[PDB]
Amino acid sequence: SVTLYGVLDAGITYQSNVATPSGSGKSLWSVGAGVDQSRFGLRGSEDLGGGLKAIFTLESGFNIGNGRFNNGGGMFNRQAFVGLSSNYGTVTLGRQYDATQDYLSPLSATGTWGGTYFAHPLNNDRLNTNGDVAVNNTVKFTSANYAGLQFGGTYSFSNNSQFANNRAYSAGASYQFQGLKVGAAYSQANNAGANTTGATDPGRSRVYGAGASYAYGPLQGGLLWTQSRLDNTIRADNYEANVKYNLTPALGLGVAYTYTNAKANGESTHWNQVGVQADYALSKRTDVYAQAVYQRSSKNANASIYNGDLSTPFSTSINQTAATVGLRHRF
Amino acid sequence: SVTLYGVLDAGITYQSNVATPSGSGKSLWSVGAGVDQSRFGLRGSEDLGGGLKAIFTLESGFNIGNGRFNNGGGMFNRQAFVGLSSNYGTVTLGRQYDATQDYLSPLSATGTWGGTYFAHPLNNDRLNTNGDVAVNNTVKFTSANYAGLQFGGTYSFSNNSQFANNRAYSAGASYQFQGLKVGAAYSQANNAGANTTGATDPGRSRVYGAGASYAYGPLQGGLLWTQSRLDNIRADNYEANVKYNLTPALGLGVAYTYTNAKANGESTHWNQVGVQADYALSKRTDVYAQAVYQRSSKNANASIYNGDLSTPFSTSINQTAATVGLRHRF
Amino acid sequence: SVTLYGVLDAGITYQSNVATPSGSGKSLWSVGAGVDQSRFGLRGSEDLGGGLKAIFTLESGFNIGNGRFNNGGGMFNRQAFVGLSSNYGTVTLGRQYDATQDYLSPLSATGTWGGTYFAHPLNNDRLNTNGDVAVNNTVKFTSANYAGLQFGGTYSFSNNSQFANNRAYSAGASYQFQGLKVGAAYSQANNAGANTTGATDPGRSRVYGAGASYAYGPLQGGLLWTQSRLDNTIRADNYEANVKYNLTPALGLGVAYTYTNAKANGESTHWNQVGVQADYALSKRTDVYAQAVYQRSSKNANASIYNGDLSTPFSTSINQTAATVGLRHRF
């Protein structure tokens, strides 16, 4: 039947250099989501019989600092879908995440233990869900396990009289074998953000990616490459390596490094980001975390560690550092 | 006690001719609510004793396509009321539907099996609830069953220093006898939509209606007439509907509505017909398929109500709407 | 585990003189919250063991008249916090009420049986919660009972590159001894309401207060003084006395009177407000109430009984009276 769930993440974050309305740059202290975005949701599954089940998920994301909605402000701004699931496959209709989150995000640190501040610059590949990365009016298929091989795709309508006014589609697959995990996916959007009725909330946007991860005992490591492109021209490539080791069953330590190269009108911009996180689990539901991330950029641009808000100003320097200590609770 | 409930309706809908910002008109494909508006809510009843019970309903409507609120965007945009219920009657305070939804809507196809696209042109009679048809700041009384005879009324404040800035009131009754069901109601609004504090969310508006329905076995039929008036435009709606249950799990429905309107002394005509097939996978989950056709007079255009009044008209006098969808209850 | 709760308050209210867009003033009849603001929420507490428990509260306020959010419109506009609680103290992070609501509000009639219309003029001391009195990005500590002595403090971040751009902090204490209860608190805000990222949702604001209350049998009485100050210049002092007598265990009668003296640019304004309330409890969850409030001001200003909305226009005269009859239900 119906199940209520949620995760609450509240912590204090210090950012070293955030630009001011005046030309200067000052340190920013904030109370908000550190790793995961605070959310609450409803999920259910009704056994219709004959191997068929009706399924639904309604998930709403909010900021525990101010209590407001994020991801645009709708009711169920993260996920809202219903569909039928069989042993053949699952088809779901509604506001959902595309294949890049289904198959690429599990390989990245921002999609696992790292969360927000371990995201790639400006979340250009849309890997982290502490942002409006879901697409509206989406039809999604997810295949069966097929011996660890799972593939799926999504197609998103614009709900406007113009077909390509806000269309999006994606496809991906992943294979898991013991500790080894491999995945790849692709997503495309057409005129993303034009109208309110379309898939991408307010040219041609594309994301490519492939990566792998291995987990032997307490040690888990992974490497991933992603590319985000915008045409009709900006292009960016992200190269990430991440490692998490569980010293204690309750204590895990994670390190990640990302190099980002971007082509904005044919000239190169570079980002190098490194971050460390220690998380201690007080229980299955509650844990405490602490993390520090460092990013320095090339001299032709500035540094910005993604803090969940794209509107946050860049650093005045090529230097920015972010440190967070927080509490995370599930129910 | 308190109960969480909800209905999820997701389907793909095709409209034949929806106008574009440019003069041309194009077909529109959308993923959203086909029959019923997706909603979730909390309902409760506490037995206070002595035949008295406290009741409340908080109901929020949203679109599963984008996850956003409808009906203006408030939290509980469909219904939000509390009140006391006794064997004499029930009084409730809050954002509620008027008598036309209480007594006329059960007779219409748009209020039963048809839903959104089976509504009369532009939902002029306010029969369909896939829109902002509730009224704010409403006092409502509903009588006892009295041998199948139930009557009720509503009174709605403006919550502004001008009383008639957004006043509304309604009254209606319905009688049910074996297969026969009969109902009639009246609703009036004064300066509807003027201020944000008033009953109708952003002259003198009135709605009339009376109809009847009969249900023998798998065959259920009904016919209804409604009239909507605007003062300080006039429209009459004539509807006939039938639903037959081929299989206990499979139902077929057909409906036809003719609408005649007098706007500044000029007559406008609409004829709307629709067919729907629904199969019940369970008590909670079903799948449906439907097709609707509407033709207008050449002095105007056709528009099948799709739940959004801002949706542009057809460029032609012809419009067609087709939907296939999934509906789940929890 | 997690618990869903809520309060529904619906009543009809009559105000004698509310200003109109045209110079005239007309009587206003409204359907809305009489005493308490309608709300729903989720609360939970997980026993982490060893005397430590994780706790959270997510509370949303709405108006049953229109179904809309109040207190700015966010999801959890009243309270949204998570924290850890031990026998030493409790620390919580998120959108919370400051010390003035923790320790001063219980002494006032507006914070107990009176509610909205028993609030001081313009709710200047922020004692009533039928308004946006919570502060964002707040770290709060609440001490143990210490033999009826409870003290606490709050600190609220600006979440902007400027530290004091929308900063707030508060501190307070309360002592309870049999029937007698005494409390005092202090709150300060810097540039309240400037930016969206700060503590107070859209100069220098401070509130002081101290009071005491006694309850012997069915007779309950209290007296309280508060001062609210605004610079960059207004200052106001409120003197309140309140009495509640329970004729029947289910029937209570309440009377309250407040005198307010204000300094606006060096000129004095006077308010005298009197109100009476009778409430009959149909059960522990359901009760019915009736109340009438009268306020008179000096001729250099106007009268306005706080109706939960600060934007409500004043009376055209120095005279205003407010009467409400309503139903209040808990779940």
Side-chain angles (χ1 to χ4, degrees):
Chain A
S1 75
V2 189
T3 287
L4 171 72
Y5 62 95
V7 49
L8 304 189
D9 182 2
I12 304 188
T13 85
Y14 158 81
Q15 285 181 305
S16 57
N17 183 269
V18 181
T20 296
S22 58
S24 61
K26 297 299 176 181
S27 61
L28 182 145
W29 295 70
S30 59
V31 176
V35 181
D36 289 311
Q37 186 180 75
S38 301
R39 84 208 55 166
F40 71 100
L42 290 168
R43 189 179 62 238
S45 70
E46 173 200 13
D47 189 4
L48 295 176
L52 185 61
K53 61 175 177 184
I55 57 163
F56 75 88
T57 288
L58 306 172
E59 195 175 88
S60 181
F62 65 102
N63 184 351
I64 200 162
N66 53 21
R68 300 182 238 266
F69 292 117
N70 45 32
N71 312 320
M75 180 47 204
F76 301 111
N77 45 72
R78 294 184 51 93
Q79 261 183 325
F81 65 84
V82 66
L84 300 167
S85 165
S86 76
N87 296 111
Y88 294 163
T90 300
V91 50
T92 48
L93 290 70
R95 172 187 182 101
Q96 314 170 62
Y97 300 114
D98 61 17
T100 59
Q101 290 94 38
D102 289 342
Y103 305 102
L104 290 184
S105 286
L107 305 162
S108 67
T110 193
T112 58
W113 54 266
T116 312
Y117 297 90
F118 285 81
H120 304 165
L122 289 63
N123 196 25
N124 61 95
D125 46 10
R126 300 174 86 178
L127 265 43
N128 187 249
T129 56
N130 198 343
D132 203 358
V133 298
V135 287
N136 302 330
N137 319 312
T138 298
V139 189
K140 172 190 287 197
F141 166 69
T142 303
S143 71
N145 193 17
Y146 293 156
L149 174 153
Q150 201 145 26
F151 61 93
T154 72
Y155 186 91
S156 313
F157 288 77
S158 60
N159 288 29
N160 199 4
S161 44
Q162 307 90 17
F163 199 55
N165 199 333
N166 198 336
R167 270 191 299 112
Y169 56 81
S170 83
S174 167
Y175 183 84
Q176 161 178 333
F177 187 95
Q178 206 249 346
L180 173 69
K181 303 172 175 55
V182 171
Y186 163 67
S187 81
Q188 174 169 130
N190 294 350
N191 297 325
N195 63 94
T196 69
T197 77
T200 308
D201 291 331
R204 179 163 79 90
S205 182
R206 301 157 81 180
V207 181
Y208 305 79
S213 178
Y214 182 73
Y216 178 72
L219 188 272
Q220 175 176 7
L223 307 101
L224 163 72
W225 158 84
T226 61
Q227 173 159 67
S228 61
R229 310 173 180 179
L230 303 92
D231 309 297
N232 190 305
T233 277
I234 312 100
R235 183 183 63 90
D237 289 73
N238 312 276
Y239 310 92
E240 186 192 318
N242 65 84
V243 49
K244 177 168 186 65
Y245 181 84
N246 301 90
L247 289 300
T248 295
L251 190 154
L253 197 141
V255 183
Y257 166 77
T258 301
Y259 161 75
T260 303
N261 191 13
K263 179 193 70 56
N265 287 335
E267 182 167 348
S268 175
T269 308
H270 297 255
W271 282 282
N272 286 268
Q273 183 173 328
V274 64
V276 59
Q277 180 190 112
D279 49 84
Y280 174 66
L282 295 82
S283 75
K284 308 293 281 178
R285 309 243 310 280
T286 311
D287 69 84
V288 163
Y289 60 92
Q291 62 182 34
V293 178
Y294 309 79
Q295 185 190 106
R296 197 166 196 160
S297 71
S298 44
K299 295 179 180 179
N300 51 13
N302 295 275
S304 196
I305 307 166
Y306 183 73
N307 66 348
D309 183 7
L310 274 186
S311 68
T312 193
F314 287 165
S315 166
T316 61
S317 59
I318 52 168
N319 268 326
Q320 189 183 89
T321 303
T324 304
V325 181
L327 172 64
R328 190 173 58 192
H329 178 70
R330 300 177 190 259
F331 65 90
Chain B
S1 75
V2 188
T3 286
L4 170 73
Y5 63 93
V7 151
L8 303 188
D9 182 2
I12 304 95
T13 83
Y14 159 80
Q15 280 180 302
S16 56
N17 183 324
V18 180
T20 296
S22 58
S24 61
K26 299 298 177 181
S27 61
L28 183 145
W29 293 70
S30 60
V31 176
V35 182
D36 291 311
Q37 186 182 76
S38 301
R39 85 208 56 165
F40 68 97
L42 288 169
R43 186 183 60 239
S45 70
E46 174 199 13
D47 189 4
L48 295 176
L52 187 61
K53 59 175 177 184
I55 57 163
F56 75 91
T57 288
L58 306 171
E59 194 173 275
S60 180
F62 65 103
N63 186 308
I64 202 162
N66 52 21
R68 300 183 78 190
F69 292 115
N70 315 297
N71 312 319
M75 182 46 204
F76 301 112
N77 44 72
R78 294 183 51 93
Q79 261 182 325
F81 63 84
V82 66
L84 300 167
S85 165
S86 75
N87 294 111
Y88 288 64
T90 301
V91 173
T92 48
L93 291 190
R95 173 189 184 102
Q96 315 171 63
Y97 301 116
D98 62 17
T100 60
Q101 290 93 38
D102 289 343
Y103 306 105
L104 284 29
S105 287
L107 305 162
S108 67
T110 193
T112 58
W113 54 267
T116 313
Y117 298 91
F118 285 81
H120 302 166
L122 292 177
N123 197 26
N124 61 95
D125 46 10
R126 296 174 82 83
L127 270 188
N128 186 250
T129 57
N130 198 344
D132 203 358
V133 299
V135 287
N136 302 331
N137 319 311
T138 299
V139 190
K140 173 190 287 196
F141 171 70
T142 303
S143 71
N145 193 18
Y146 291 156
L149 172 63
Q150 202 144 27
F151 61 93
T154 73
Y155 187 94
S156 313
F157 289 78
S158 60
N159 288 29
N160 199 3
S161 44
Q162 308 90 18
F163 200 53
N165 197 0
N166 198 336
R167 269 192 298 113
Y169 56 85
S170 83
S174 282
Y175 182 83
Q176 161 178 333
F177 185 95
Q178 207 246 346
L180 174 69
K181 302 172 175 185
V182 175
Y186 162 67
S187 80
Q188 175 168 326
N190 295 350
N191 294 325
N195 61 92
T196 70
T197 77
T200 308
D201 291 331
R204 295 180 182 275
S205 182
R206 300 161 82 179
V207 181
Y208 309 93
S213 58
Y214 180 73
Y216 175 72
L219 191 273
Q220 175 261 341
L223 64 88
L224 162 72
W225 158 85
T226 61
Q227 173 159 166
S228 61
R229 304 176 177 176
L230 303 92
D231 307 293
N232 190 36
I233 311 99
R234 179 184 61 89
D236 288 73
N237 313 276
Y238 311 91
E239 186 193 318
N241 65 85
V242 61
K243 178 168 187 65
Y244 182 84
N245 301 18
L246 288 299
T247 296
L250 191 153
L252 197 287
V254 183
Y256 165 77
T257 301
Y258 160 75
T259 303
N260 190 340
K262 176 185 64 56
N264 286 334
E266 178 172 350
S267 60
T268 309
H269 296 255
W270 281 284
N271 286 268
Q272 182 174 328
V273 64
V275 300
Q276 180 191 113
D278 49 303
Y279 176 67
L281 295 171
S282 76
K283 307 290 281 178
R284 308 171 51 192
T285 310
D286 68 295
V287 287
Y288 59 91
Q290 63 182 35
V292 178
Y293 173 77
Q294 185 188 105
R295 192 171 192 162
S296 71
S297 44
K298 293 181 179 179
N299 52 14
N301 293 29
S303 196
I304 306 166
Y305 185 73
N306 66 347
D308 183 7
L309 275 186
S310 68
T311 45
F313 288 80
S314 165
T315 62
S316 59
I317 52 167
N318 271 50
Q319 190 183 90
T320 294
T323 304
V324 135
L326 171 64
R327 187 167 54 192
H328 180 70
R329 307 173 195 259
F330 66 94
Chain C
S1 75
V2 189
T3 286
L4 169 72
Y5 64 95
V7 176
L8 304 188
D9 182 2
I12 305 188
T13 84
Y14 158 80
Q15 283 181 303
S16 56
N17 182 213
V18 181
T20 296
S22 58
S24 61
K26 299 298 177 181
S27 61
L28 182 145
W29 293 71
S30 59
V31 176
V35 182
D36 290 311
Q37 185 181 75
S38 301
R39 84 208 55 166
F40 70 97
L42 286 307
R43 187 183 60 238
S45 70
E46 174 199 13
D47 189 4
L48 295 176
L52 185 60
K53 59 176 177 184
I55 56 99
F56 75 92
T57 289
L58 306 171
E59 194 172 283
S60 180
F62 64 101
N63 183 261
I64 201 162
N66 52 20
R68 298 178 76 192
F69 291 115
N70 45 32
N71 313 320
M75 180 46 204
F76 301 111
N77 46 72
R78 294 183 51 93
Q79 260 184 325
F81 65 85
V82 67
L84 300 167
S85 165
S86 75
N87 296 111
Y88 293 164
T90 301
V91 174
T92 48
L93 289 69
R95 172 187 183 101
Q96 314 170 62
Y97 301 117
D98 62 17
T100 60
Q101 291 93 38
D102 289 343
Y103 305 104
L104 290 183
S105 286
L107 305 162
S108 67
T110 194
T112 58
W113 54 267
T116 312
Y117 297 91
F118 285 80
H120 303 166
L122 291 177
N123 198 25
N124 61 95
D125 45 10
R126 304 176 90 84
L127 265 43
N128 185 249
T129 57
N130 199 344
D132 203 358
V133 299
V135 287
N136 302 330
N137 319 312
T138 298
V139 189
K140 172 190 287 197
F141 170 70
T142 304
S143 71
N145 193 17
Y146 293 158
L149 174 152
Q150 264 187 358
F151 60 94
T154 74
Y155 184 80
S156 313
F157 289 77
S158 60
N159 289 30
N160 200 3
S161 44
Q162 306 90 18
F163 201 56
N165 196 221
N166 199 335
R167 192 185 73 184
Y169 67 103
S170 83
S174 166
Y175 183 84
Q176 161 179 333
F177 187 96
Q178 206 248 346
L180 174 69
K181 302 173 174 185
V182 59
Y186 164 67
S187 81
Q188 174 169 353
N190 293 350
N191 192 8
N195 60 92
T196 68
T197 77
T200 308
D201 291 331
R204 176 166 76 88
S205 182
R206 297 164 161 204
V207 181
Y208 305 90
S213 58
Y214 181 74
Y216 181 73
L219 189 273
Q220 176 176 7
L223 63 88
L224 163 72
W225 158 85
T226 60
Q227 172 161 114
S228 61
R229 176 92 48 88
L230 302 92
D231 308 296
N232 190 350
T233 301
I234 310 99
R235 181 181 62 90
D237 289 73
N238 312 276
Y239 310 91
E240 185 194 318
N242 64 84
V243 175
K244 174 168 184 64
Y245 181 85
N246 302 265
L247 288 299
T248 296
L251 189 53
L253 197 287
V255 183
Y257 165 77
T258 301
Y259 161 75
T260 303
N261 192 47
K263 177 191 174 183
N265 287 335
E267 177 169 347
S268 290
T269 308
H270 298 77
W271 281 283
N272 286 268
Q273 182 173 328
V274 63
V276 298
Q277 180 191 113
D279 48 11
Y280 177 67
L282 297 171
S283 75
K284 306 194 175 181
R285 310 244 310 280
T286 311
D287 68 307
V288 183
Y289 60 91
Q291 63 182 35
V293 177
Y294 174 76
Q295 185 189 105
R296 195 168 195 160
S297 71
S298 44
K299 294 180 180 179
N300 51 13
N302 296 276
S304 195
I305 307 166
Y306 183 73
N307 66 348
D309 184 7
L310 275 186
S311 68
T312 298
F314 284 79
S315 165
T316 62
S317 60
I318 50 94
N319 271 327
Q320 189 184 90
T321 169
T324 304
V325 56
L327 171 64
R328 187 159 50 111
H329 178 70
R330 306 174 194 261
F331 66 88

